[PDB]
Amino acid sequence: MADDPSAADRNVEIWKIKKLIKSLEAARGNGTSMISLIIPPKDQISRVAKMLADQFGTASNIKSRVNRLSVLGAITSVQQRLKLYNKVPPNGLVVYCGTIVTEEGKEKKVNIDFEPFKPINTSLYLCDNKFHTEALTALLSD
């Protein structure tokens, strides 16, 4: 109404999710290892476990060992969180893992995954050394 408790809870909620977004979009590197996909309430996580397992082959083709190995690490993380919950919630389960190089040129793997309160209506999968949570973006504007 004016100074209710729910109000504050809302601010912190948006502030948190907002932090993960600003970082993601601001997360860029050099080696193709930015695995980011969205699993809405409809796609069986299981189908992803195996689907990702095959993706590993793509790395084998990557001449650049640095990238090949890096790619494997990403798919590995997202694969972990997947089996972790081993469930398909209504809010969905999104994962974000990419390699960002700093000034010195040191890559940073951000292994983060969970089922937030951001239900999507379409699965997405794109990895090209840079990701961008469309769901969170579009959902934010509203």
Grouping H, G, I as helix, E, B as strand and the rest as coil, residue 111 is coil
Under DSSP, the state recorded for 28 is B
CATH 3.30.960.10 holds for 1-142: yes
The pairing of beta strand 107-109 with beta strand 112-114: unpaired
Q: Are 93 and 39 in contact (CB under 8 A)?
A: yes
Rounded distance between C-alpha atoms, residue 116 and residue 139, angstroms = 13
Rounded distance between C-alpha atoms, residue 85 and residue 87, angstroms = 5
Half-sphere exposure in the Cβ direction for 77 (13 Å, CA): 22
Method: NMR
Apex 26 CA angle, 24 and 28, nearest 5: 90
Q: Rg (Cα) of the chain, in Å, rounded?
A: 16
The pairing of beta strand 107-109 with beta strand 99-101: antiparallel
**First-residue to last-residue Cα distance in the chain:** 22
